[PDB]
């Protein structure tokens, strides 16, 4: 069963290098049958931006993790708030960055 | 000594009044957290 | 290494907005650092107008508190520079120059370009 | 405020002192620690900061242009003076909106 893992990223070169990262720990550990397909959303600027994309293309992906990083603005840091929100509706633990 | 991780306002508040007055001298020493310490409280910061 | 590229209309027309554009290469916009806009004059007198920091500050001239404005976008590391109300002397070089966020250090300047108004 | 400096046309040989003085409106220097910060800039390339605190040299600079200051006043001196000490001088100030910078001083060596 492919399990597709989502990454919250800002630039592209985040979304190559976190999809060599899946690359390479999937040739590190076990790769017969768990083989990770990377998938990378970038950062909207609204929390509920972040839950549609989230829940369009991840959560039917069938996402085990997601993968969150910090607010560009540091006024309010409420962008991993939706997606812990997200993970935590069935208490899926959200991977901080 | 004073110690506290907060917003960079209050910071560089405590650090204009610490200026303005007697509180720069050798015996008045304290640690500051993270981010308190880039801006404007890292211009009106002490020399130690 | 770390270095700053300009770009802009080049030629300005009678009220209308200054678009300038600078890039940063070797560092991200919004990790650290600061960057200030200058306008160097012949006669070797820089001229600040207002710097933005990595947090989202804009701190500028009081006299240009309401026809300047700084925007950035960190999926390209890209920063441009709004001038709105502007007049006939703009006739300068224009700076992106960089400073460490809390006046520490001045380290990459860049190259700057010369710009009138016709 | 525009800042005032000290000399224009001075003319400075090599083995003597090269004090340039400035003037800015009010007491920049506070706490002991100047905030004064002195630039050489040659005529081609950009501006950098040579002399930062107005006090203490950045790390990739000899011992050559030391100075100090106070309140208005702040000078910079070349000991020894070399070839390369003919350049534009600015002493300039980043205290509070509006930091105004100074003027231009022009130093030949004879």
């Known amino acids: 069963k492919i399990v597709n893992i989502g990454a919250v990223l800002s630039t592209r070169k985040h979304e190559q290098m976190f999809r060599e990262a899946v690359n390479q720990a999937n040739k590190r550990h076990g790769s017969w049958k768990i083989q990770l397909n990377a998938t990378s959303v970038t950062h909207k600027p609204n929390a509920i931006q972040m839950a549609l994309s989230v829940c369009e293309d991840l959560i039917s992906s069938q996402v085990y993790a997601i993968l969150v990083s910090h607010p560009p603005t540091p006024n309010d840091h409420f962008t991993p708030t939706p997606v812990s929100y997200t993970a935590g509706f069935y208490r899926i633990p959200v991977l901080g960055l | 000594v004073i110690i506290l991780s907060a917003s960079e306002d209050d910071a560089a508040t405590v650090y204009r009044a610490a200026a303005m007055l007697n509180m720069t001298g050798s015996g008045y020493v304290w640690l500051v957290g993270e981010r308190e310490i880039s801006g404007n409280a890292l211009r009106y910061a002490p020399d130690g | 290494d770390v270095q700053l590229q300009e770009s802009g209309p080049g030629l300005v027309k009678p009220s209308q907005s200054l678009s300038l554009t600078c890039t940063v290469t070797?560092?991200?916009?919004?990790?650290?650092?600061?960057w200030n806009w200058i306008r160097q004059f012949p006669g070797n007198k820089l001229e600040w107008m207002g710097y933005?920091?990595?947090?989202?500050?804009?701190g500028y001239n009081p006299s240009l508190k309401s026809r300047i404005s700084i925007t950035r976008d960190t999926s390209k590391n890209q920063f441009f520079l709004q001038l709105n109300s502007v007049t006939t002397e703009d006739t300068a070089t224009y700076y992106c120059?960089?400073?460490?966020?809390?006046?520490?250090?001045?380290?990459?300047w860049g190259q700057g370009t010369s710009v009138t108004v016709s | 405020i525009v800042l005032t400096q000290s000399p224009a046309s001075l003319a400075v040989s090599l083995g003597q002192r090269a004090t340039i003085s400035c003037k800015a409106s009010?007491?920049?220097?506070?706490?002991?620690?100047?905030?004064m910060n002195w630039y050489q800039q040659k005529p081609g390339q950009p501006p950098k900061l040579l002399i930062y605190?107005?006090?203490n040299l950045e790390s990739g600079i000899p011992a050559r242009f030391s100075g100090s200051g106070s309140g208005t006043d702040f000078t910079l001196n070349i000991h020894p003076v070399e070839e390369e000490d003919a350049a534009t001088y600015y002493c300039?100030?980043?205290?509070?909106?509006?930091?105004?910078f100074g003027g231009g001083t022009k130093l030949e060596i004879k």
């Open positions: 933005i920091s990595y947090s989202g500050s804009t």
């Open positions: 605190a107005a006090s």
């Open positions: 120059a960089r400073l460490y966020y809390g006046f520490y250090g001045m380290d990459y």
């Open positions: 009010q007491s920049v220097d506070y706490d002991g620690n100047s905030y």
């Open positions: 070797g560092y991200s916009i919004t990790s650290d650092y600061a």
């Open positions: 300039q100030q980043g205290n509070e909106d509006p930091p105004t």
